[PDB]
Design a protein around this nucleic acid. Sequence first.
RNA 1: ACACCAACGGCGAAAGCACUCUGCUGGGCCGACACUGACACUGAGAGACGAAAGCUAGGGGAGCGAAUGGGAUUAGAUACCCCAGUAGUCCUAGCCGUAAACGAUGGAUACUAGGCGCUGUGCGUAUCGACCCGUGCAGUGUUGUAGCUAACGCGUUAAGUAUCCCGCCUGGGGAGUACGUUCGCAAGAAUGAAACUCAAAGGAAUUGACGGGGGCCCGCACAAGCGGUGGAGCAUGUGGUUUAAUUCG
Lengths: 118, 149, 44, 108
Amino acid sequence: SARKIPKGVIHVQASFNNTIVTVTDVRGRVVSWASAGTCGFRGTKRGTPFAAQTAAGNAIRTVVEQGMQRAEVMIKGPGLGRDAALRAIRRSGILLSFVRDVTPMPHNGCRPPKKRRV
Amino acid sequence: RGTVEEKTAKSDPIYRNRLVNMLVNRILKHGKKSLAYQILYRAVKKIQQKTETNPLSVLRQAIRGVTPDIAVKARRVGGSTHQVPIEIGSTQGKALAIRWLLGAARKRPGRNMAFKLSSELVDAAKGSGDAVRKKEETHRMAEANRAFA
Amino acid sequence: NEERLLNRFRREVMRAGVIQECKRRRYFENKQEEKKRKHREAAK
Amino acid sequence: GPLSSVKLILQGRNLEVSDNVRSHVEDKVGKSVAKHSHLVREVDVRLSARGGDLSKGPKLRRCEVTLFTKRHGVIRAEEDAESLYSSIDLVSSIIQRKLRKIKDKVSD
RNA sequence: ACACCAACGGCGAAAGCACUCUGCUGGGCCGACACUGACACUGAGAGACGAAAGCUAGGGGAGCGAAUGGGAUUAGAUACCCCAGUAGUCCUAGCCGUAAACGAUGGAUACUAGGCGCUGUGCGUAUCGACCCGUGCAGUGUUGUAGCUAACGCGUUAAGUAUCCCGCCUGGGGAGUACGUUCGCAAGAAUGAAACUCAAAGGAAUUGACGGGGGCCCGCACAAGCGGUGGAGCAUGUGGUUUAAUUCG
């Protein structure tokens, strides 16, 4: 089990080739995580909006032991996995308070690597 | 090229049905229309002999179980081939339905084409045989790749 | 809730296109004039 | 094309062909399209000669090589040189660029 | 290392210079006559500074990343892709003195349409205070008259008209090489030929063709069907082989 409080943050690591749908409490002990590599298929298929939908659905379908009402989602990063994930959470329709972005916006910190030339 | 002029489709010779006339045109091989006519109406007189319902009912109820709602169109973007499924239309599903039904009906041996089309037709009416399995193996491939669009 | 998306709509305020910008290398004024000339003309 | 390669077909017009000629054909053409890994179907090498002491006009040796490949079309190269050997080497170079055009265009 | 601010923006002689604050200090621009009275311009040789990579000495080392190593693609891959990753990147003190160090345009003065701008100050209007209009200059930009130009274009910031001062050029290779000398810890930099050989090497523009450059539109061109060939047998034609000839095209 857990603390049994039905409010908790959801983080969506939407990568450029993957998604991770994790869900955790206010302190930060994770109650479940499920990614595109978690839900079966793996390779070039993972990181597509069907993987965001299935990974989000298989992520938050297992919080029915909690039955969280007051949801709040804190996504991160670029990729094709955001909008399908928000349509998945709104499909489950639980009390999504506010979604938000927490993406790392650097202030010219490190040099990003070589351009691809492909 | 732009389009095809709209359509002209007549009904069945003796039952006045636009589906069964489509089926008698699809069983036609090189002009022998009286023989394809003969095969279809011997199949109907066979289907009155097997069960005791309307042949429109067992035929339409058969081809509802052959018609797919979605299929694989192996399309391309940037040189990259996605197996993305695109939702097929209705009368397209009719033509594919009696297509797989008829070609699969040209495999089950033993007797004349009336028994062959009858047997694969009732197998479509019961979810057995090969046409509805062909529906499944063309249906569980587009289901297998929904991670594209 | 309804199926409206204001996070994408609000997202183009400060676009995630500052992250597709920062994957590839720190390069000087040739591609900063290409990207920032096309970007100084996209907003005018 | 000694073994495993595309099927060789010679044509000899105005030219009695020898051992050194078609040997130079299969060794220069075949052994320069020996680093291929191509299942090209058919190579038609049509090797005609003309002029000089044979008839009116300058001394010419003219080869056309045609490849009916599976791999994106058919190709042919005609070159006309002072000797047979310079013709077949020159068409050998041209068909090297055309096959690297085909293999290199298969990318991504 | 310093996001948004960032602007076809400001400053520096150029290279360069952007998180903020402080200290020292250069340079620019404008006004009043406040002063001196031609003190001006250029500059051989000289001297300074001079992106990046490089080297000596010592720190430091997160990211990135030559070389390297492994995986992949590939006929092959010492390469593009990917995963690790050393010198280097940063700083102190030096050396090196080259870059497409480009505005591909040495500097200075005088004169020769305009339009649209931006930056800094000055005057008048307007209010009495921020505006706002015209302007006096200096600088920066964009279209453009005259004129020049082989053309493209440049055009008050000329590639215009003139004057001055310095550098550099006289066909292309050979060759920024050889030899010598100076500088440099080395890497190399600078100065810089000839033998021989070629009748071209180049610039701007045009017309075509072509592009694994766009844009648009047809075609049984692909896709959707339907039916075949390639498998078997035969008819026939060609190539090869054979023969005295297997006529020739």
